[PDB]
Amino acid sequence: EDQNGNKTVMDSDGITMESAKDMNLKASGDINLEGTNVNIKANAEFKAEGSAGAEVSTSAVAVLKGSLVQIN
Amino acid sequence: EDQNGNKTVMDSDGITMESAKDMNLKASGDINLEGTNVNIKANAEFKAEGSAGAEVSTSAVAVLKGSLVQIN
Amino acid sequence: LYRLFNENVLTDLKITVEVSDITSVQLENDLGVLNPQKPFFPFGPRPIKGSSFIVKYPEAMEKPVTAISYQMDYLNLPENLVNHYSAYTIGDDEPLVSDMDYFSVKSFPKSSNDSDQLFSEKSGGGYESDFEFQIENGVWESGLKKELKISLERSFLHEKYAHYFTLVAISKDTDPTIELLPNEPYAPLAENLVLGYTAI
Amino acid sequence: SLERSFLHEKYAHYFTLVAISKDTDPTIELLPNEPYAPLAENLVLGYTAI
Amino acid sequence: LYRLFNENVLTDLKITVEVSDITSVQLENDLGVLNPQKPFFPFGPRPIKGSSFIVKYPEAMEKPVTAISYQMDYLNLPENLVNHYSAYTIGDDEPLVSDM
């Protein structure tokens, strides 16, 4: 833990990280996330990009919703 | 910081992690990301999968764009 | 003044709070969340019998509220609404929409308006809506969900447009003119809602 | 489960036949209405166990 | 009461639990999962012979349930479902839907 309110804890509930201001994860290679359930939330905006394409897929049901949905 | 160029810093600007080669995040349980603005970028490809489905949603506007968009 | 309150005993305190010009409310359809900033369809893009519109504001609903109300504007309304449906008739050419009473709603929290009509005449051109509600002893009724809900008694006839259009076009008795064809049914797209309340 | 459908698959066929009849002049009363789909709400459950 | 129960041996215990007005249920149809808080289509927005509707509630299903039931409302029902299909006839103009 630091003096600015940033904190990392490893315990019986897994690994928790909190930031006082922001968080930047970078790699020169690939970034791979895995888990049973992946939940991403934003209180303002969510964006995702790929210079060579992007894909969302599932074996069951894909869902796209909003008050307005635009495609190209 | 290590001898191979990998580095983690906690300071007044939040938490920064950089990898010399790659980065692997894994869990036996769920992975939960939160923040005001979540920005994901790739210089080649972006993929996301779920064996029991996937969902993208928002209260305002959903956007899907590319030079070609294919659905099923 | 400090000297006047040392031995005099306080017995009762009454607190009244009045709030106006609130635009930070939550709006819902049978299809989902609406975005209040932009023009939206109360009752859906294709309104049907039984469709609804719900207004929520937790800051008021958690208080012992005694009065609450809101207003809305419509965007591309026809110049006259009863005349708009003159081509939609049954039996011996009798109009489905006889008069403005056709367009009515039910208020589940029990509105105080004189009549149950949906559109009220705007002092300028076009139409607006107005709704006002009361709670006799500042006690919410049991069984209501602390939301303001209004539902449609009758549809706007979207389901009949194709049928009437066809019949005019294929008539062998008359030559179709533009005045004989049905106009497109109206879906009531709206914007700029404002709420107010009192609690004691 | 449903024993019989609500006839969505027949609307186009009946609509067409009325419209092209050479025996009668079509009127609104002779055209088929759109088949119903049963939209519902307020589901309430109760159970007992011993 | 404490004294009265010190020597009178207990032989049997019976427990009965009754619950009503449950709304947190999981609903499904052939296309997927329903939001029970909003008007929903039980057999889909458009129904076929053999389609279905399923109600699930694990809290009751894990118990020795002797009885269970549910209720639903319909919206937008035509004034008369039989008259609604009077234009749909076969053979010598005989209605497909003769009654409820």
From TrEMBL, chains A, B:
Name the chain's protein.
Phosphoserine phosphatase SerB
Q: Which organism is it from?
A: Algoriphagus machipongonensis
Span within the full-length protein is 510 to 581 of 581
Automatic annotation (TrEMBL), chain E:
Q: From which domain of life does this come?
A: Bacteria
Q: Indicate what this protein is called per its UniProt record.
A: Uncharacterized protein
Q: Which organism is it from?
A: Algoriphagus machipongonensis
According to the entry, what is the taxonomic lineage of the organism?
A: Bacteria, Pseudomonadati, Bacteroidota, Cytophagia, Cytophagales
Full-sequence portion shown in this chain? 401 to 500 of 1050
